[PDB]
C-alpha cells in the first residue's frame, strides 16, 4: 500500500507522520526543519483554525509565504484548507496533499485535486462548519454513519478524476467521547475500505478527558497511546504535533507487532 | 478476576497496577508521596545494584515491595512490613523462600541466565529464550508453592543476561509467559532494549519508548508494570484501558 504524493509515493509499510505546522494565532522553517529532522515524513500546514472557529477569507498571506519557504526543505507538503481558492495558489507552489476539513462537499475542491493530480484527504464532520459542528455532535450510529458519508465522499471524489483518497474518521469534530470512543473500536471497519486511513488525536479533548490531563499542551503520552492503538487497528498514517514522541514510540511499536 | 496478594491484602488485577520505582543507591520521603499521588499502586525500593527509609515510606499505607540479593536485608524488610517480596536472583536461594512463605508474603521470580549480574551476560546462549526462560519460571514458582510461598509473580527479567534478540522474542511472545497463569511483572524502564529499538541514548530519556513496550506488554496481558515515570503510564494507561477494554 502506497500513499501517492503528486510526484512522489510514499510507502505506507510503516507508519507515516504528518508533522502538524498550525499558521494561526492562538492555541516556521526553523520549526518545520525541526519535525523533520524528528522524522515527520510529510509536513501539514494550516493558517485557519478548524478548533471547535474563525473564519479567515483571505488567509493567502498567512499560508503562501511559509508555504513556499517549507517547500524548499525537499519535504512533501499538506495543505489543510476548505478554501478552493487557497488550494489552487497552494498546489501551484508545489503542495503534495490537500486536507479539506469540511470532506471534499465542494466540487470546486474535487475538481482542483483531480486538475493537479493530488490526493484529497476526506475528514468526516457532520456539518460543514466548526463553529457549530459540536452543535450537531448526535448520531443514530455514528460509525455507520461516518463510514457511509466517507465512502460516498471518496466515490464522488474517485470517479471525477483525484488520483486517490484518503480518509479521516475525524476525531473531535462535531464528536463527543462516546463517538470518538466508537470510532476508535471499530476503526479497523473504516481501514477495510481499502483506502489508506489518517488518524489525529494529538492533544485533543478525548485524550484529556480519557487521561486526565487538564493543559492539552501536556497530553503526549494519552495521544502517543491512543495513536499506537489506532496503528494496531491498521492505520498507516498520524496528524501529529510532538514528532519525536512518536518516532520513538514507533521505533519499539514496530519492532514488537 | 485475578489479584495479587500483598501481605494483608489483595489488589484487584482488573485493571494495570503500577510499581513506582524508588531506588536508594549512589531522608526526605517527598518522591514516596509524589509516586502516591501520581497513580503508583505499589512503591518499589532497592538499594542495591534501605531500613530508615522503608520504615518511613510504609507509613504511607501503601504496598510496598522491597529488591535484594541478601536474606539479611529481606528479614528486616518484612519484619518491618513489606508487602512483597523481589527477588532479584531468580528466587535460587531457598532462604528468602523460607522468609516469603513465614511472612506470608508473595514473591517475585524474575529469569536471569545465573545470579551474578558481573557475567549474566556471558550466559546468553539459548537455545529457545522463550521457552527455557517459561520452564525456569514455572519450576522456580512450583518450588516456591510448596515451600509455603502465598503467591509467585513471574517477570521475564528483560535485560538480564539476554541479548536483544532474546529481548524481542520474549516481549513478542510475552503471552506464553502470561498462560502460565501467575501474574506477570515486567519492567523495562530505561532499559538499553528500549534505547535500542527507539534510538535514544540517554537512559533518562527514555519514557516513550518504554510506554510504547509497556503498552504492548499489556496488550499481551501483562497487568502489572515496574516502571520510573509512574505519571506518564497513568495517562497512556487512561486511555489504552479505556479502548482496548
Ligand atoms: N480542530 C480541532 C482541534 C481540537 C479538537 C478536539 O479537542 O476535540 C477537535 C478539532
Keep these: 500500500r502506497t500513499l501517492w504524493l503528486r510526484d512522489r509515493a510514499l510507502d505506507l509499510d510503516r507508519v507515516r507522520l504528518l508533522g502538524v505546522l498550525n499558521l494561526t494565532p492562538d492555541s516556521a522553517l526553523e520549526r518545520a526543519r525541526e519535525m523533520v529532522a524528528e522524522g515527520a515524513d510529510i509536513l501539514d500546514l494550516g493558517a485557519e483554525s478548524t478548533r471547535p472557529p474563525v ?20 519535504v512533501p507538503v499538506s495543505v489543510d484548507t476548505r478554501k478552493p481558492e487557497v488550494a489552487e495558489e497552494a498546489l501551484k507552489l508545489g503542495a503534495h496533499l490537500l486536507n479539506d476539513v469540511t470532506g471534499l462537499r465542494d466540487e470546486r475542491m474535487v475538481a482542483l485535486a ?36 466517507l465512502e ?11 488520483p486517490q483518497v484518503v480518509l479521516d474518521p475525524g476525531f473531535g469534530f462535531g464528536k463527543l467521547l462516546e463517538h470518538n470512543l466508537a470510532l476508535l473500536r471499530r476503526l479497523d471497519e473504516i481501514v477495510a475500505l481499502g483506502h489508506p486511513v489518517l ?14 490531563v487538564e493543559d492539552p499542551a501536556q497530553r503526549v503520552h494519552g495521544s502517543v497511546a491512543a495513536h499506537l492503538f489506532a496503528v494496531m487497528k491498521g492505520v498507516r498514517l498520524l496528524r501529529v504535533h510532538d514528532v519525536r514522541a512518536h518516532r520513538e514510540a514507533l521505533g519499539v511499536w514496530e519492532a514488537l507487532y
Aim: no cysteine.
Design 199 to 212: 488518524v489525529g488525536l494529538s492533544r485533543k479533548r478525548t485524550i484529556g478527558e480519557l487521561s486526565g
Design 55 to 74: 473564519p479567515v477569507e483571505e488567509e493567502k498571506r498567512r499560508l503562501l509565504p511559509v508555504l513556499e519557504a517549507v517547500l524548499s526543505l525537499g
Design 152 to 162: 460516498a465522499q471518496a466515490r464522488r471524489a474517485l470517479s471525477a478524476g483525484v
Design 114 to 149: 483531480a486538475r493537479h493530480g493530488v490526493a484529497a484527504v476526506v475528514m468526516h464532520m457532520p456539518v460543514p462548519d466548526p463553529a457549530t459542528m459540536m452543535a450537531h455532535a448526535r448520531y443514530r450510529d455514528v460509525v455507520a454513519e461516518v463510514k457511509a458519508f
